[model samples]
Target: HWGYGKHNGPEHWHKDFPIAKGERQSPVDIDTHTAKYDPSLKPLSVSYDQATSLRILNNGHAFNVEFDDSQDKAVLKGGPLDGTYRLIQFHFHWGSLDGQGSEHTVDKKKYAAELHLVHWNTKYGDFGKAVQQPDGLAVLGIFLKVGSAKPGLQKVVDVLDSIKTKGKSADFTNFDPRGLLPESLDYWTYPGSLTTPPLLECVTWIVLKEPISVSSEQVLKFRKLNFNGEGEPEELMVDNWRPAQPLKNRQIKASFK
Candidate 1:
């Protein structure tokens, strides 16, 4: 078995998924001092139809709000992207408690949680195929700070109770995701891999500089979800974030001065 022994975590993922140690791995610590501003990077264009939401599920790792990407109802363009990439889904990574949860850090500072909006480049056929290409996936990373109760995020919290157990899902209707974005499009762009297992080195990470808000109480709800059951090792789905990886020779570009 890959888990149930406090051993199915990232620490030993490289043994099973060799690329976990590959170059350009993700969730790098964003050192602001070294984050050089690149005026060449265009502002991001996120065009999403609130009605594209399909279902929400607890995938045993984190809860995901899946979207209907059959068409281009939700597409992300510009800001280190070529054409419009179809929005597939969005998920979260959080700590069991506040002060540390986000995968990527800003000058060694961690946040309470992080949201990943995943998109695929249709040029590569589909998400599965795109995952094999170096420039096929785009993930928008949004840090969540504990503070005001974000009305935009409340809708998501409302559905958490329905999917408390792993593999559980519920129909998720029209929900506006843009409301969760920061007012400014300022961000840090880099070439990296997915933070989780398989750690595909195909992602173009676009992390927002400005963090959004979520109440501490709202974040507590996420802690109750279980990652495993069925008489297996009981693992609560919290602190589900990857540690920061090495930057090596990769450059971190800032969209703002």
Candidate 2:
């Protein structure tokens, strides 16, 4: 998924996360025929401080933000996992100069892009320690489609001017992550590993079936950010997602009736 402009893009990641060769990766063609396994839905609630500074980093092909957990908190009411996981950080995956960008494929179909909201158990003191536990991390996978109108992402994209170049970051204060969640929180649940390298397998994934649309121009703007140094040639950064893996005797269950 990594391309020219950003940090080593896909080339570096493939080495780090070799699981890309696995059968049951994501962004696959969603098998609608598969039995939809519904489990007890969990109620999630979160609060964000307006003064909280949202920091965005252009990590090569992807753009990520390290959230201040002290300014945010989330509680999960039910489902396969029932615990209050604190919001830690959020990042993305996409392709280089292409429309298809995502980390996990459904059956084999890739999407325009994917966003990951990383959370961890408060019991571990911090996210680094929590990720080591069996139930340490919970990641929400959100798909993005190429289009014209950006629903509510202005709060995010508006700051692009500040960090247009690589290694550049802007101080965005008082942003709420809830504004990014789709209206339908309904999602599919599965046991999975981190889409990136070191492929931490302790993560529980909640992928939203619904997609959020963004304009093609926005995609270009995303690519404009400097991935490395000013002297290096800028790479056309676009789709940076990973191919979908196989179900691998694994069952992906949905949360619903």
Candidate 3:
């Protein structure tokens, strides 16, 4: 029921999801100058398996690459996180143009798009249960900018035509998510919530300082997706990102100075 349109946009989310106005909302503006460099924060390590990817789906809000999370094959640990978290799936948030698509920003700067690799604490049983706990979810946010085409992400783009409409899904296997990340893993971490409805304040957001390249042609293909399903009112899935929330009483720790 919640879309990025004027009526159903992020502004209207609070009507149904009262937590939308919660204290730890996500997609915040990272003020690099103010972010404290934490020398004590452990360096982050991420290991992902290509075979873990099951399929891709236009899951209402964003197109997600779902994975098999029965085991801990794809895991993210360290960097403001305790214990290990398993990768559940990854999704994208983008705007209609090359100038703005990212959910989180740096010093008020915007990117062409943003990628979120979602994970959950295994201690909480699974994603369903973890999402309800304050420290049960972790998300690695990678900003996407206009430049060279991303080699790894193109795998998703290649199959875009098949799932151009909502509720559509296509099998996509053997794609390595790490290849889509930039060379540097330096990041700013903070306590935040899911950027969408059910906006649960459970995510430990680790946002990379660097951005990956995404060609102009590749980004336009994402806009071709429909927010509306077949035979419904036609609408493009553009500006599918919530605006940055207020910082409140949170602190953002920088992994790099």
Candidate 4:
């Protein structure tokens, strides 16, 4: 069972996780001012289908969505991105409490939370084995900050009761992740590795400069999610996020003319 503590953080991840050190990690600080390359921005139009399956899994750290890859249809037409990428999974990085959120700081600015919409190259078979390959993954990062009533996000928040326990799961029979994509697809593209363990250097990170809105109450609700059971109360699962890592010598390309 996964519980919150120093033992549950990245320092302890490599001990048990098979691909812990191998997977690409996330929340890297992107210094827009320092980037040398500017790639054209690709705006894709995504329309959700009725057959899409959204499964909520209690992965001990937080509730994540195992988004079905077959049902999504998105058209990425421009920028350095010219191919099709299917949706795979989506999850959030939250804080220990309502006041503080999970995503790390770049220049000291903290957002309420961060939602990662994981995708992969459809050209490389399917998501199952594709994600394991370095060139097979493409992740879209959307920052979510506290705001007023956000009806667009209510669909996700409404289902918290289904996955209230750790190791539990719930199938959102009729949900599509495409509805959640921001109106602005203009993003910063860079060739880097996965932000998690088994950090393969094969991902094309497209982080949107625009963030969606979520209510403060919704933000706290994410933080309060417990990863323990009846017998274990001390196990508080909160703040599941990693600090920004060094970008090394990677070139970050933006989509701005």
Q: Candidate 1, overall lDDT? A: 0.89
For candidate 3, the 10 contiguous residues with the lowest summed lDDT are: 45-54
- Tens-place lDDT per residue, model 4, 117-233, is 777777777776766666677777777777775675677787776666677788775666666666687677776665555556667777777777878877766755677753567
The better candidate by TM-score, 1 or 3, is 3
Candidate 3, residues 1-257: lDDT per residue as tens digits?
88898888999999999988889999899998999999999889898853388899997678999889998889999999999999989999999888788999999998989999999999998799999899999999999998899887787888988998889999887778877889999999999999998899999999999899988888989988888787788788889999999999999999987
The digit string of per-residue lDDT tens for model 2 on 1-257 reads 43433465434655656755554344344564583766455644444433244687666646677667773344332456666677777777665554567766655567677888887777777878886776777788887778655655676776766765567666765666666666677677777776665556667777887777777776666666655545677654455555555567667777655
For all candidates in order, the CA lDDT equals 0.89, 0.64, 0.90, 0.64
- Sorting all predicted structures by TM-score, with the top scorer first, yields 3, 1, 4, 2
Q: Considering every candidate listed, which one attains the maximal TM-score? A: 3
Residue 10 lDDT in candidate 1:
76
After superposition of all CA atoms, the RMSD between model 2 and the true structure is 3.6
RMSD of 3: 1.0
List model 1 lDDT by residue over 1-257, tens digit each: 33222577777788888888888998999999999999999999988754389899888888899998877888888998988788999999999889899999999999999999999998987899999999989999999999898889999998998888788899997888887898888999999998987789999999999999999899999988888854567678888888899898899999999
**Worst 10-residue lDDT window, candidate 1:** 1-10
Shift in Å, residue 114, candidate 1: 0.4
lDDT minimum window of 10 residues, candidate 2? 44-53
